[PDB]
From a paper:
As expected, steady-state kinetics reveal that mutating Ser69 to alanine completely abolishes enzyme activity. Once it was clarified that Ser69 was the only residue being phosphorylated during catalysis, we exploited this catalytically impaired mutant to trap the bisphosphorylated intermediate that has been proposed for this class of phosphomutase. The protein was crystallized with Glc-1,6-bisP and the structure was refined to 1.9 Å resolution with a single protein molecule in the asymmetric unit. The overall structure of AfAGM1_S69A–Glc-1,6-bisP complex shows a closed conformation, compared with the open/semi-open conformations exhibited by the two monomers in the AfAGM1–GlcNAc-6P–Mg+2 complex. However, the inactive AfAGM1_S69A mutant–Glc-1,6-bisphosphate complex has an overall structure with a closed active site and represents the reaction intermediate with Glc-1,6-bisphosphate buried in the active pocket. The complete closure of the active site is achieved by the establishment of extensive hydrogen bond interactions between the reaction intermediate Glc-1,6-bisphosphate and the protein. In addition, the 1-phosphate group establishes hydrogen bond interactions with R33, H70, R289 and a water molecule, the 6-phosphate group makes hydrogen bond interactions with T29, R505, S507, T509, R514 and the backbone of G508, and the 3-OH and 4-OH groups of the sugar make hydrogen bond interactions with E380 and the backbone of V363. Thus, extensive hydrogen bond interactions are established with residues from all the domains resulting in a closed conformation. This provides a snapshot of the reaction either immediately after phosphoryl transfer to form the intermediate or before the second phosphoryl transfer to re-phosphorylate the enzyme. Although the inactive AfAGM1_S69A mutant–Glc-1,6-bisphosphate complex was crystallized in the presence of 10 mM MgCl2, the structure reveals the absence of this metal and the presence of a water molecule instead.
N-acetylphosphoglucosamine mutase (AGM1) catalyzes the interconversion of N-acetylglucosamine-6-phosphate (GlcNAc-6P) to N-acetylglucosamine-1-phosphate (GlcNAc-1P) in eukaryotes. This enzyme is a member of the α-d-phosphohexomutase superfamily of enzymes that catalyze intramolecular phosphoryl transfer on a range of phosphosugar substrates. The reaction catalyzed by AGM1 is the third step in the biosynthesis of UDP-GlcNAc from fructose-6-phosphate in the hexosamine pathway. Previously, AGM1 was shown to be an essential gene in the human fungal pathogen Aspergillus fumigatus and has been proposed as a drug target.
Author numbering: 2 to 542
């Protein structure tokens, strides 16, 4: 790196101060913490984004400033690689080295990195960024801008966007004018693509009943309202938006949003939904969705990420069979350990498909899903998508089927591949997917719920002094450490019918998570509470 660059790096860093004693870690999805801790971190990330882009011969790299499901006082920064995927895993160590460098030395760490990565410093760097509605985002975008200006990257501020909009923009700008061309790299282009794909998938069917979408008082509320202006007119889809208060920042994810619904297993307390109204909740950056409704008995029923995965795997399997291509589109379902055991059992015994369990975090699920022609992957919390391999897409595009029924199914599959946000999932595209599926099957939430019955389950968020002593393995289902704790968990889970519990450190918040399921409500709650007390005791010595 040039002497003027190395100077502008140290000059710009002078404006900030590292918080004393904090060690930063990349975590499940990127640096995330209380927003007053973030300046030097974000500055470090601007440096890393420049290096990444240069290493990739000036391809657009994205930065999304968000803490996603986290409470409003947090923020964070996620890196996006050129095709929309999460920043390559090996590069999380480089980010963490820059973020932990004394500020005085950040210039030297930068040069140390150019040598180690072997980066051609004459390559252009091109970075595009956006943020959700969080109060700290503008300050952090200032810092990011300061880093990128110092390193002389070309950069574009896309203002407020959902996480998946930013991933979409990155993929578009890196594919524009090629055979791979994903769309126009603007917010309008995103709405146009979703709308056009949904029109095609919907040919010949209609949605029945309204959909009431809790938008977590985040950026998804205004963007979904905008998307609705683009959507086709006679599909029967009737969306009502609730919780779109992007004006009061304390409202974000507050008593509403997918994370509230999933962890508490209840509708937002401000919900005005009637019995049998079909509902869904997005989260604060619109990258999770779940569904839920009040049944005929006025009882809340949850349709979470694994319900979406299984819904999509069933539909795709029926379309591939109908299109005469079942033998050529092998479907697999990727899960994590948070998936309800009943959903795993359904995938195995009713859909008759392979499933794979991976670590928590979309990067891991996406990785495992590459092993299938069609890889359906969701986390229970409502992240996820469906990936189609090169060979699958070629089969879907080029098959010429014998009859009109087969052609209609083939065309529905082709449209689905344009609707489904490839790589990292997109909650709003997943919502249109679910709507299209129910419309084709003719199902209401009643029939979808009846596919399988979830085991009663429970999440407990446990605060400990030192979550780094909780080290997990086997798709994070067992604790290697602290010594003796897995033994206790194995012993506890065996006392309950269908008892299954595991504990692991969160990589997005300072807590340990406990999950438990069993055959009955009393058993699952007892198992979760006894496991959480064993964790709290261990983590708090
Ligand atoms: O907040 P988001 O929507 O970015 O979600 C992030 O955190 C979730 C919880 O991770 P953990 O249990 O380590 O805290 C993960 O399941 C998810 O893949 C990740 O992208
Ligand atoms: Cl907004
Ligand atoms: Cl939890």
């Amino acid at each position: 790196a040039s002497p003027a660059v190395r100077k502008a790096i140290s000059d710009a860093a002078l404006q900030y101060a590292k918080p004393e004693g904090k060690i930063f870690q990349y975590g499940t999805a990127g640096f995330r913490m209380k927003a007053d801790l973030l300046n030097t971190v974000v500055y470090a990330v601007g440096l890393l984004a420049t290096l990444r882009s240069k290493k990739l011969s000036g391809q657009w790299i994205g930065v999304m400033v968000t803490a996603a499901h986290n409470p409003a006082e947090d923020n964070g920064v996620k890196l996006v690689d050129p095709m929309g995927e999460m920043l390559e895993a090996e590069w999380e160590a480089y980010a963490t080295k820059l973020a932990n460098a004394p500020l005085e030395n950040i210039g030297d760490v930068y040069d140390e990195l150019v040598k180690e990565i072997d980066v051609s410093m004459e390559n252009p760097a091109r970075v595009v960024f956006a943020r959700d509605t969080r109060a700290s985002g503008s300050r952090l975008i200032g810092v990011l801008s300061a880093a990128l200006t110092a390193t002389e990257a070309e950069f574009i501020d896309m203002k407020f966007m959902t996480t998946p909009q930013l991933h979409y923009v990155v993929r578009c700008k890196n594919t524009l004018g090629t055979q791979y061309e994903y769309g126009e790299p603007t917010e309008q282009g995103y709405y146009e693509k979703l709308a056009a794909a949904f029109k095609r998938v919907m040919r010949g069917v209609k949605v029945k009943g309204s959909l009431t979408v809790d938008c977590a008082n985040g950026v998804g509320g205004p963007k979904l309202r905008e998307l609705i202006k683009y959507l086709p007119e006679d599909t029967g889809l009737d969306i009502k938006i609730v919780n779109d208060d992007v004006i009061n920042p304390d409202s974000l994810n507050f008593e509403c949003g997918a994370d509230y619904v999933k962890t508490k297993q209840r509708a937002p307390p401000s919900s005005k939904a009637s019995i049998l109204d079909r509902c869904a909740s997005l989260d604060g950056d619109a990258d999770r969705i779940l569904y839920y409704f009040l049944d005929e008995g006025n009882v809340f029923r949850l349709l979470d990420g694994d319900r979406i995965a299984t819904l999509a795997a069933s539909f795709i399997g029926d379309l591939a069979r109908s299109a005469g291509i079942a033998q050529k589109l092998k479907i697999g379902v990727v899960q994590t350990a948070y998936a309800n055991g009943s959903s795993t059992e359904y995938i195995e015994k009713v859909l008759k498909l392979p499933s794979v369990c991976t670590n928590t975090g979309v990067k891991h699920l996406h990785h495992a899903a590459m092993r299938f022609d069609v890889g359906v992957y969701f986390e229970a919390n409502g992240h996820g998508t469906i990936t189609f391999s090169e060979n699958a897409l070629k089969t879907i595009k080029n098959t010429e089927p014998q009859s009109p029924a087969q052609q209609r199914s083939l065309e529905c599959l082709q449209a689905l591949t344009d609707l489904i946000n490839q790589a990292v999932g997109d909650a709003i595209s997943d919502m249109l997917l679910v709507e299209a599926i129910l419309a084709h099957k003719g199902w209401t939430p009643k029939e979808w719920l009846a596919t399988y019955t979830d085991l009663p389950s429970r999440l407990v968020r446990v605060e400990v002094a030192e979550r780094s002593i909780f080290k997990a393995y086997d798709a994070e289902r067992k604790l290697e450490s602290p010594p003796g704790l897995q033994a206790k968990i194995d012993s506890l889970q065996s006392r309950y019918n269908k008892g299954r519990s595991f504990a692991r450190a969160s990589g997005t918040e300072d807590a340990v998570r406990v999950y438990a399921e069993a055959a009955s409500r009393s058993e699952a709650d007892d198992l979760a509470t006894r496991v959480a007390n064993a964790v709290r005791d261990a983590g708090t010595v």
